[PDB]
Amino acid sequence: GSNMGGGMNFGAFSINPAMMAAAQAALQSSWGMMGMLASQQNQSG
Amino acid sequence: GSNMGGGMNFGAFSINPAMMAAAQAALQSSWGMMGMLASQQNQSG
Amino acid sequence: GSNMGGGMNFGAFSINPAMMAAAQAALQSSWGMMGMLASQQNQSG
Amino acid sequence: GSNMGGGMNFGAFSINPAMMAAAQAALQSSWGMMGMLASQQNQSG
Amino acid sequence: GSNMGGGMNFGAFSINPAMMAAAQAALQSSWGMMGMLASQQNQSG
Amino acid sequence: GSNMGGGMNFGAFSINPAMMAAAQAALQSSWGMMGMLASQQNQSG
Amino acid sequence: GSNMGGGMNFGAFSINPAMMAAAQAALQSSWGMMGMLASQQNQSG
Amino acid sequence: GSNMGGGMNFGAFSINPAMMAAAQAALQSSWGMMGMLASQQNQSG
Amino acid sequence: GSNMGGGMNFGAFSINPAMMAAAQAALQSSWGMMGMLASQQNQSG
Amino acid sequence: GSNMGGGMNFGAFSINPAMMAAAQAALQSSWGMMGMLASQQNQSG
Amino acid sequence: GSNMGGGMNFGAFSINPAMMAAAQAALQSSWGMMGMLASQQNQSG
Amino acid sequence: GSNMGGGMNFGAFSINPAMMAAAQAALQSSWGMMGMLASQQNQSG
């Protein structure tokens, strides 16, 4: 169960994330005003 | 279960994420005002 | 289950993400005002 | 299950993503005001 | 299941994505106001 | 299942994507106001 | 050298520019959404 | 050398510029959403 | 050398610039959302 | 050399700039959301 | 060399700049949300 | 060399700058949210 409240950002954000990663499974994400990522990585072998 | 509240960003965002990644499975994403990514990576072998 | 609330961005975004990735499976995405990407990468071998 | 709320972007976006990727399967996308990409990459061998 | 809400972009977008990719299967896309790409790449051998 | 909401872009877009890609299967696309591309690339050998 | 930018006005305008003057040489002008005036009243006696 | 930026006004304007003057050489002007005036009243006797 | 930035005004304006003056050479001007004036009243006797 | 920044005003403006003056050479100006004036009243006798 | 920063004003402005003066050379100006004035009244006798 | 910072004002302003003066050369100015003035009244006799 997930819920969130409304918000208004007057200021100016800058997001410059230099991510890096090596894996059997990899996901990389960088979003602006709003986002919900529900990623399920189930692996075998 | 996922829910979010409405928001209004008056300011000007800039997002310059220099992501990098090597994997059996890879997903890369960078979105502006709003996005929901539901990625399921299930692997075998 | 996924839901989101309405939003109005008055400001001017700029998104210059220099992504890079090598994989058995690869997806790359960069969207503006709104997007939902539901990518399932299931691999074998 | 995916749903999104309506939004009106008064500001002017610029998106210059220099993506690059080599893979068995590859998808690359860069969209403006709105898009939903549901890509399933299932591979074997 | 996918659904989206209506939106009106008053501002002027510019999208100059210099994508590049080599693969067994490759898809490249860059769209303006709205698009939904549902690409399934299933490979063997 | 895919659905989208109506939108009216008052501003003037410019899209100059310099895409490039070499593959067993290749698709390249760049559309203006609206488009839905459903491409299935199934390969063997 | 001179140059101008672009603006879109969806609101409604009502201009009522009353004016009066003497005239050894006189220019009087009124205009709506757009207009450029370059005048030189060079006189000799 | 001169240059200008771009602005979009969705609100409504009402201009009533009354004016009066003497005139060995006189310029009078009024305009709405946009306009550039460059005048030189160079006189000799 | 001169340059300008960009602004968007959703509020409503009402300008009533009354003015009066003598005139060996006189310039009078009024404008709405945007405008650039460059004048040189160079006189000789 | 000159330069300017960008501002967005959602509030409403009301300007009433009354003025009066003598004039061996006179400039009078009034403007709304944006405007740049560069004048040189260079006189000789 | 000159430069400026960016500001967003959601409040409402009301300017009433009354003024009067003598004029061997006179400049009078009033403006709303934004404006840059550079004037040189260089005179000779 | 000159430079400026950025400020956002959500409150409402009311400016009434009355002024009067003699004028062998006179500059008078009033402005709202933002503005830069650079003037040189260099005179000779």
CA neighbor of C28 nearest in space, from A37, D23, A41: D23
Contacts of D9 in chain B (CB under 8 A): 33
CA neighbor of B6 nearest in space, from D5, F4, A1, C13: D5
Token pair for residue D35? 């898009």
Q: List strand residue ranges (DSSP E) for J1-45, in order.
A: 13-15, 19-21, 26-28, 36-37
Token pair for residue E39? 């690409």
Assign residue H10 a region (left: φ > 0; alpha: ψ between -120 and 50; beta: otherwise).
alpha
Q: Which residue of G has its CA nearest to H9?
A: G9
CA distance K4 to J27: 25
How distant is the alpha carbon of residue A22 from its chain centre?
17
**Residue at token pair 């979009």:** H8
Of A4, A33, A38, the CB nearest to B38: A38
Amino acid type, H9: N
CA distance C1 to J6: 41
E17 close to D18: Cβ distance less than 8 angstroms: yes
CA distance J43 to K44: 6
Find residue F27's DSSP bridge partners: E27
> Which 8-state DSSP code applies to residue C24?
E
L45 close to K45: Cβ distance less than 8 angstroms: yes
Q: How far is L34 from chain K (nearest CA, A)?
A: 5
CA neighbor of E37 nearest in space, from C41, D40, B38: D40
Find residue A40's DSSP bridge partners: B40
Token pair for residue H6? 């771009």
CA distance C25 to J9: 47
Touching subunits for chain D (3+ Cβ pairs under 8 A): B, C, E, F, I
CA distance I8 to I10: 7
**Residue at token pair 């602006």:** A32
Look at D11 and I10 and tell me if their CB atoms are within 8 Å.
Answer: no
CA neighbor of D4 nearest in space, from F34, C6, E9: C6
Secondary structure (3-state) at J29: coil
C-alpha dist (Å) from residue H26 to B9, B32, I25, J23, J37: 47, 52, 6, 11, 18
Our answer on whether B and A touch (3+ beta-carbon pairs < 8 Å) is yes
C-alpha dist (Å) from residue C8 to A26, A33, F4, L13: 32, 10, 18, 26
Laid out side by side, the sheet with A34-35 consists of: A34-35, B34-35, C34-35, D34-35, E34-35, F34-35
CA neighbor of A15 nearest in space, from F38, G38, B18: B18
CA-based max dimension of chain F: 49
How many Å from the N-terminal Cα to the C-terminal Cα in chain B? 31
- CB distance from G10 to chain I under 8 Å? no
Resolution in A: 4.1
Secondary structure (3-state) at G17: coil
Secondary structure (3-state) at G45: coil
CA neighbor of F30 nearest in space, from F15, F41, F8: F15
Strands E14-15 and A21-29: unpaired
Determination technique used: cryo-EM
CA distance E8 to F7: 5
C-alpha dist (Å) from residue J27 to C24, G21, I19, K29, L29: 71, 15, 11, 8, 11
